[PDB]
């Protein structure tokens, strides 16, 4: 889980946690 293309960081104002009943590709 370490590549030189992916930027390791996070945005404190948004939390990523998808709902299992919903796919993450919802518009």
């Amino acid at each position: 889980n370490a590549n030189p293309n992916v930027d390791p960081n996070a945005n404190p104002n948004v939390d990523p946690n998808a709902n299992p009943n919903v796919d993450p590709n919802a518009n």
Epitope: N1, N3, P4, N5, V6, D7, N9, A10, N11
Partner: antibody
Framework: QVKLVESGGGVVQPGRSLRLSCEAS????????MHWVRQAPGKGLEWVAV????????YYADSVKGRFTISRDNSKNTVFMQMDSLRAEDTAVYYC?????????????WGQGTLVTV | IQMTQSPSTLSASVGDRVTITCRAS??????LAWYQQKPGKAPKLLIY???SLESGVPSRFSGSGSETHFTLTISSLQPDDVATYYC?????????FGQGTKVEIK
């Protein structure tokens, strides 16, 4: 904004080192790196070379290991490519590529290609 | 790293289930992307991380797979969506494309 523009090339005879330039038209080049990729007629795309900003990994492709010479240029953002001992099966269209992934999505910014014929 | 794609030809009418296989060389992580190229143009990214769909794309495409086996599937064909499809791996510093899969006609 980023809009890669490729220039420099034309009709050549067997044996020469015509220059190739990929001066950018937006932003800067202090992040990650930049690649080269070719396509010959009647074939798919293939890898050429990768250069990061300043001295870094310059890993080459499979057919051209340790034979080409590619370098950056401090300020006036550009990537310079130099080949020698040209064969005949090196006529194609060349592009300029810059890819990097972020926490918001991808960024492609596919360049434009130019024709090179022996 | 040498890759390959089996279905070098396609034969399906307007609206059909199609599958494409993207067998890999060794055990890489979930680092794979799919490119689509139409004639006389420049390639365009379709899906990255082998699962995501990327913004501004029709939902009729779907990729899946992991470990060493990766696939792609479309619900239909549509005359608008005939082109060539390439596989890419973007781990490490260098890239490596694959072979083409021409969507044949008649």
């Amino acid at each position: 904004q980023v809009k890669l523009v490729e220039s420099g090339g034309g009709v050549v005879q067997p044996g020469r080192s015509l220059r190739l330039s990929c001066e950018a038209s937006g932003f800067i080049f202090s992040t990650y790196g930049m690649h080269w990729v070719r396509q010959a007629p009647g074939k798919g795309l293939e890898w050429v070379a990768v250069i990061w900003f300043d001295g870094s990994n310059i890993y080459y492709a499979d057919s051209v290991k340790g034979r080409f010479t590619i370098s950056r240029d401090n300020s006036k953002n550009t990537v310079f490519m130099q080949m020698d001992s040209l064969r005949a099966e090196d006529t194609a269209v060349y592009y300029c590529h810059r890819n990097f992934y972020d926490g918001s999505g991808p960024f492609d910014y596919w360049g434009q290609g130019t024709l090179v014929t022996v | 790293i040498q890759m390959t794609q089996s279905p070098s030809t396609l034969s399906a009418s307007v609206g059909d289930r199609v599958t494409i296989t993207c067998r890999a060389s060794q055990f890489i992580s979930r680092w794979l992307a799919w490119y689509q190229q139409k004639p006389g143009k420049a390639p365009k990214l379709l899906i990255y991380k082998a699962s995501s769909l990327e913004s501004g794309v029709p939902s009729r495409f779907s990729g899946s797979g992991s470990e060493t086996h990766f696939t792609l599937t479309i619900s239909s064909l549509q005359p608008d969506d005939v082109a060539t499809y390439y596989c890419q791996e973007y781990t490490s510093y260098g890239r490596t494309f694959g072979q083409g899969t021409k969507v044949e006609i008649k």
